[PDB]
Amino acid sequence: LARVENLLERLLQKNPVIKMDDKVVAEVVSRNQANSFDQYNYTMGGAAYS
Amino acid sequence: LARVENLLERLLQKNPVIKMDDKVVAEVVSRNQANSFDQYNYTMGGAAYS
């Protein structure tokens, strides 16, 4: 039963830090903002960038 | 004590994947960017979109 706690405390060492990539988040946010911008431009006919 | 292991395995079956919505994140980011833009415009008098 001692090696049960051996593994439990060994794997408790796991870092509670999950690093998430910012580039993909930024690209997704940009795409969603572009979708919103296209929607708004369509609602105003063509009185926008295109 | 076997059903302890059975239930714990069945619960380990769970997928460690949590999808998070992108439209809400994009809207929050857009609102915060609008707040920052308004701050910068105010600090520059009115030499901006408004």
């Binding site: 039963l1 090696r3 049960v4 593994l7 439990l8 794997l11 408790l12 796991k14 999950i18 998430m20 990539d21 993909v24 988040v25 997704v28 | 302890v4 292991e5 714990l8 395995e9 380990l12 997928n15 460690p16 994947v17 949590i18 999808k19 998070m20 992108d22």
Partner: peptide, 27 residues
């Protein structure tokens, strides 16, 4: 008892990975 140990080890090992899927890409 040993089965409890192995199950807990595997459970935390799987938990390490975590999710946070944007739409399909990871993080």
């Amino acid at each position: 008892a040993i089965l409890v140990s192995e199950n807990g080890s595997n459970f935390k090992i799987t938990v390490t990975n975590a999710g946070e899927l944007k739409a399909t890409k990871v993080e």
